[PDB]
Design a protein around this nucleic acid. Structure first.
Length: 58
DNA sequence: TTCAACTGCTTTCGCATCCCAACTACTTTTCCTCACACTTGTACTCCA
């Protein structure tokens, strides 16, 4: 069974409101172990086993 | 002694006007490159 989820970051933002949040990581403000599931661009490696709780993008 | 509006009730889980942008314009930011009018002698004879 296949399922698609639309991760969207313009869902809350007004058309006039400028850009607030950015895919990726922010430096010097760091939780580790997100890097087992996720990649440098904040997107998951494809082929990765996830469960409920696991991070799906940063 | 009756007509006519105001009346709560059908199930049982879970499903499911303001802003932005376009292209073409015109403009400013300045820094770099020279000319244009003025003047004393000297030169060629000038009139004595």
């Amino acid at each position: 069974m296949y399922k698609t989820e639309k991760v969207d970051l313009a869902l809350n933002r007004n058309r006039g409101d400028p850009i607030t949040q950015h895919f990726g990581f922010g430096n010097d403000e760091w939780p580790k172990e997100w890097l087992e599931k996720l990649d440098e661009d904040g997107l998951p490696y494809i082929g990765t086993y996830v469960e409920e709780g696991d991070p799906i993008c940063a």
